[PDB]
Amino acid sequence: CPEVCTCVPGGLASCSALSLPAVPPGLSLRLRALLLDHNRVRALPPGAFAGAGALQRLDLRENGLHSVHVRAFWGLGALQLLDLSANQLEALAPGTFAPLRALRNLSLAGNRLARLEPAALGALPLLRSLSLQDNELAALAPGLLGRLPALDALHLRGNPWGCGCALRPLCAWLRRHPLPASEAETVLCVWPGRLTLSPLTAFSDAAFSHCAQPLALRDLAVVYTLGPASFLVSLASCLALG
Amino acid sequence: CPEVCTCVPGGLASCSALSLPAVPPGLSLRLRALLLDHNRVR
């Protein structure tokens, strides 16, 4: 008999719309498949669900989440569904999602994240679906794609995202899985022109706008010697012309 | 079928007084003639 809301039979979907800043007081060793829509959580408390070693579904939607903690999920290792819709996140504390490896869908809608740490997210071999609905993310670290081995369902509509090299990892994700051909996902990016606007599906493989390449080994094999090459050529020209 | 409100016949008058800081979640291509009174959008 929890205090905030009554015990729920079957998978115990928790009380939703509890509007709680850190976490609603929960005193039970049986709660499972929790349901936490529209809460005011700003930080996941350490060891919030340590007693419940197993869990299946969590529904943290519409939160004021600005930061998390490493050890909120030490006692949680079986989660498969989790949502992070409509947050105010600033950074993901490393080790928060690291203990979790059974997750299959992780919606991350409406976050205020400028960039995400690949080490903080973890490998997550089972994750395949991830969402960015009404997020403000603009610069996605490619390490997230490097660690995710099965990301094949991406939701992204609604972002102050500007076209450019930051979209190149996401453009690669599109060109390996063309989900946005469906009308539901029609995310956009800012073409360099401030008054202009261009879709993501318009941003094709070529998309010759800016930031061609940061690295080039062909030119790196000669960049070391180009200076001495020019100086020696000028020296030899002076010697020969005299 | 929106989550915050329902699909209103004719002009899709969305529910008002929702108070969501960014925008109420909308997944629809038919919404028109919206009503969005007393929100907390900044």
Which among A144, A112, A98 has a CA at the least distance from the CA of A42? A112
B-contacting residues in A 89-128 (Cβ below 8 Å): 109-110
- What is the experimental method? cryo-EM
Resolution of the experimental structure, in angstroms:
3.9
Residue A231 backbone phi and psi in degrees, to 5: -65, -45
Q: What is d(CA B3, CA A212) in angstroms, rounded to the nearest whole number? A: 41
- DSSP H helices in B1-42: none
* A contacts of B21 (beta carbons < 8 Å): 88
Q: What is d(CA A147, CA A94) in angstroms, rounded to the nearest whole number? A: 14
Which among A110, A155, A160, A166 has a CA at the least distance from the CA of A128? A155
B4 near A CB under 8 A: no
Query: Please, are residues A197 and A203 in contact by the beta-carbon 8 Å criterion?
Result: no
* A contacts of B29 (beta carbons < 8 Å): 183
Q: What is d(CA B3, CA B25) in angstroms, rounded to the nearest whole number? A: 7
Q: What is d(CA A136, CA A109) in angstroms, rounded to the nearest whole number? A: 9
| CB pair distance less than 8 Å for B29 and A85 | no
A26: left (phi over 0), alpha (psi -120 to 50) or beta: beta
A44/chain B closest Cα distance in angstroms: 21
The residue behind tokens 């709660």 is A31
In chain A, the N- to C-terminal Cα span, in Å, equals 100
Give the residues across from A91 on adjacent strands. Answer: A67
- Kindly state the DSSP code that residue A91 receives in the 8-state scheme: B
Looking only at the bridges linking them, the beta strands covering A198-199 and A188-189 are antiparallel
Q: What is d(CA A133, CA B27) in angstroms, rounded to the nearest whole number? A: 10
Cross-chain CB nearest to A86 (options B22, B27, B29): B22
In chain B, the N- to C-terminal Cα span, in Å, equals 25
Query: Please, are residues A11 and A34 in contact by the beta-carbon 8 Å criterion?
Result: no
A182 near B CB under 8 A: no
| Closest chain B residue to the Cα of A110, Cα to Cα | B22
Query: Please, are residues A174 and A200 in contact by the beta-carbon 8 Å criterion?
Result: yes
Looking only at the bridges linking them, the beta strands covering A57-58 and A153-155 are unpaired
A62 near B CB under 8 A: yes
Q: What is d(CA A35, CA A21) in angstroms, rounded to the nearest whole number? A: 16
Residue type, A110: G
| CB pair distance less than 8 Å for B23 and A62 | no
* B contacts of A133 (beta carbons < 8 Å): 25
Q: Where are the beta strands (DSSP E) in chain A?
A: 57-58, 81-83, 105-107, 129-131, 153-155, 188-189, 198-199
Query: Please, are residues A89 and A63 in contact by the beta-carbon 8 Å criterion?
Result: no
Interface mutation vs chain A, best among B4, B18, B19, B23, most A CBs within 10 Å: B23
